[PDB]
């Protein structure tokens, strides 16, 4: 059977906020809405475009399921991705522990169904990020739609 929670996180998301515990060298100019496709076998496929230096990176990432609901793995187990819903509606928080580009990085991402920034959602996102120990800047990102 497929996870009701896994289906609940499927579809179009706007990537809004983005805390960290380390500086991220590459930053996209703007990002395309994120799409989460629930697959048979509990795995989530995830696509986003990052417009950066005036060019479109077309990301595709598969979050492999685990024994713990909420915990997904990617990049051949190199990155963990916890997925939790916000108390604010139409908003989720990703929390990516792991390492990428040969560098250990802890990020948090604020997902929203609607592009309209919610100051209540951002507040809660900060509070959480700080509690987890992500105490850097909070990039609210530019939401473009196409290249």
């Amino acid at each position: 059977a497929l996870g009701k929670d896994t289906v609940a996180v499927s579809g179009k998301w706007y990537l809004k906020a983005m805390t960290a515990d380390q500086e991220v060298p590459e930053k996209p100019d703007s990002v395309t809405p994120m799409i989460l496709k629930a697959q048979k076998g509990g795995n989530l496929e995830a696509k986003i475009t990052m417009l950066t230096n005036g060019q479109c990176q077309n990301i595709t990432v598969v979050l492999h399921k685990t024994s713990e609901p909420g915990k997904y793995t990617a990049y051949e187990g190199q990155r963990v991705v916890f997925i939790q819903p916000s108390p604010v509606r139409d908003h989720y928080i990703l929390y990516c522990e792991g390492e990428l580009h040969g560098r250990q990085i802890r990020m948090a991402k604020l997902l929203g169904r609607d592009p309209e920034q919610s100051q209540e959602a951002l507040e809660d996102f900060r509070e959480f990020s700080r509690a987890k120990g992500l105490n850097q800047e909070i990039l609210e990102l530019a939401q473009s739609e196409t290249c």
Partner: antibody, heavy 126, light 107 residues
């Protein structure tokens, strides 16, 4: 208040370019992957094309690929199927359908057509 | 290309359970959907995501997708169920439909 209703149906000649259109109510067409499905008289169902909620993502059957176009006007809340270079094979009852597992708040990799139009018949002959 | 396969025809008596089957490689790794097309009507989704039933559809209908075949099962089969059932699944950036199974409730 029927949710999907097709139009553009009638008669055409091999050298034609009929455009079908599906008028939607109850939901926005920007919100769902929307598919066209033909059924020939006597024959069974045959998927023609889909357009994702992305609106940029469009796939067609190889049978029709190159000849057909799918598109939608979110403002008019209508979905279109531009049939060109019409063959005798194309003659069928054309349905527009909504992939309910291709929604902005539910994308499951398992197409499911909950909403079925009432169709519109197309006959191709010079 | 990828092709689903169903018996052209199935026959059952009133009450007897009916078993329509769908066959293809990588099924059970794929999600299947079932449609009922009653005589002269439009198609109607009866089973989605292999086993999941839409609302309104009676409990008599049930799904299964074990291995390389998928089955639509109709208990308490009665006149109303007489129709052409089609299975469908996604592959190669295409939606594949089966050829359908005319189900006759022998009366």
């Amino acid at each position: 208040q029927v949710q999907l209703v097709e139009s553009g149906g009638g008669v055409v000649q091999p050298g034609s370019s009929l455009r079908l259109s599906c008028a939607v109510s109850g939901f926005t067409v920007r919100s769902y992957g929307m598919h066209w499905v033909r059924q020939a008289p006597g024959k069974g169902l045959e998927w023609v094309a889909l357009i994702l909620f992305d609106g940029t993502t469009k796939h067609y059957a190889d049978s029709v690929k190159g000849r057909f176009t799918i598109s939608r006007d979110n403002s008019k809340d209508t979905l279109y199927l531009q049939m060109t270079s019409l063959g005798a094979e194309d003659t069928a009852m054309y349905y527009c359908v909504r992939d309910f597992n291709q929604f902005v708040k539910r994308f499951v990799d398992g197409p499911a057509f909950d909403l079925w139009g009432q169709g519109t018949r197309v006959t191709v002959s010079s | 290309s990828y092709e689903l396969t169903q018996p052209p025809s199935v026959s059952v008596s009133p009450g007897q359970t009916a078993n329509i089957t769908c066959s293809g490689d990588k099924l059970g790794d794929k999600f299947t959907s079932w449609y009922q097309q009653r005589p002269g009507q439009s198609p109607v989704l009866v089973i989605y995501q292999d086993i999941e039933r839409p609302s309104g559809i009676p409990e008599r209908f049930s799904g299964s997708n074990s291995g390389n075949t998928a089955t639509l099962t109709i208990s308490g089969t009665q006149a109303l169920d007489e129709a052409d059932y089609y299975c469908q699944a996604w592959d190669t950036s295409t939606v594949v439909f089966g050829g359908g199974t005319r189900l006759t409730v022998l009366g």
